[PDB]
Amino acid sequence: MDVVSLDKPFMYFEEIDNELDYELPYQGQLKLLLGELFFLSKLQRHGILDGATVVYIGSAPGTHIRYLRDHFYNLGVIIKWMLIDGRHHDPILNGLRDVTLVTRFVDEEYLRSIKKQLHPSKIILISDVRSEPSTADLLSNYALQNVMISILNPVASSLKWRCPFPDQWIKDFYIPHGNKMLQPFAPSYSAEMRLLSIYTMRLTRVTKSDAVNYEKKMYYLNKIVRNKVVINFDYPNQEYDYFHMYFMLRTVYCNKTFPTTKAKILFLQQSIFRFLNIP
Numbered sequence: 001m002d003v004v005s006l007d008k009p010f011m012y013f014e015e016i017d018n019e020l021d022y023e024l025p026y027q028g029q030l031k032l033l034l035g036e037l038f039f040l041s042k043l044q045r046h047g048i049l050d051g052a053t054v055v056y057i058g059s060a061p062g063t064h065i066r067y068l069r070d071h072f073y074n075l076g077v078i079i080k081w082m083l084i085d086g087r088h089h090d091p092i093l094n095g096l097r098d099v100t101l102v103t104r105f106v107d108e109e110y111l112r113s114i115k116k117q118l119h120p121s122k123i124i125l126i127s128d129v130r131s132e133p134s135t136a137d138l139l140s141n142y143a144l145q146n147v148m149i150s151i152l153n154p155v156a157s158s159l160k161w162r163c164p165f166p167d168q169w170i171k172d173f174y175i176p177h178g179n180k181m182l183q184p185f186a187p188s189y190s191a192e193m194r195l196l197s198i199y200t201m202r203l204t205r206v207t208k209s210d211a212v213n214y215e216k217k218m219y220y221l222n223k224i225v226r227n228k229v230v231i232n233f234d235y236p237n238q239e240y241d242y243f244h245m246y247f248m249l250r251t252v253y254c255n256k257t258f259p260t261t262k263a264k265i266l267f268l269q270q271s272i273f274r275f276l277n278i279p
């Protein structure tokens, strides 16, 4: 891995400043855990996580979600979880009174009834639904996620966002405004991000040129940026993904006090890796 010297990683897609012509155990749970710890801890900074209800659609198996609960439960934040998926959840989510497990594939009708029974409580939406996927599949998925936002009307949302490849384009489509969070420990050449929105919902047109820009910026990120060693980085592991994770984990609150920020992040990573059984 070529060495580099960085003050900060690329946190959002917009920050990628170059492009290139495209050519761990249970790492998926770690990717989701970090991204949702980042999202929900940003909402905790804005004082809008407390009292809300996280509706997580496409949450199964959702092993990492148990860490998410326990984290915010141990911080005293009052959160109710509603995990909705047609598949069965990881049994480690069992026996939690503040976590509701729902075995159902959501549609427009069922989103209406969810909203009725949670209204007027704050809803926070995390969607990870998926139906290799074609562009029609992605378009249907993203149409469903817009439907989720229009009906649930969440105070914030984190949406699975991967632009369809330019060589598989079908038509222009619309997604909500928001910041496109980059995911550490994503698969080596994944172009998936999490669309993070805080609602105060305007839709944005996505064009085939955007698809090209995504494909080229993410390839530069995956081929060049993520294969670097951050030599100035003071951490037991200086590979970019750990540098990336480190900056996400410092937005996380914690009840315990540490002599240094590095001490905190190290403890957090130790706690996350241990629970997910990562060496």
Ligand SMILES: Nc1ncnc2c1c(C#Cc1ccccc1)cn2[C@@H]1O[C@H](CSCC[C@H](N)C(=O)O)[C@@H](O)[C@H]1O
Residues within 6 Å of the ligand: 032, 057, 058, 059, 060, 061, 062, 063, 064, 084, 085, 086, 087, 104, 105, 106, 107, 128, 129, 130, 131, 140, 141, 144
């Ligand atoms: N409507 C829905 N409601 C509930 N769950 C739905 C769906 C749907 C769909 C659809 C659809 C959309 C438009 C038109 C027609 C159909 C998919 N899923 C679930 O998304 C997960 C992806 S992988 C999660 C991984 C997980 N985050 C983990 O912790 O590992 C799977 O578990 C799958 O069962």
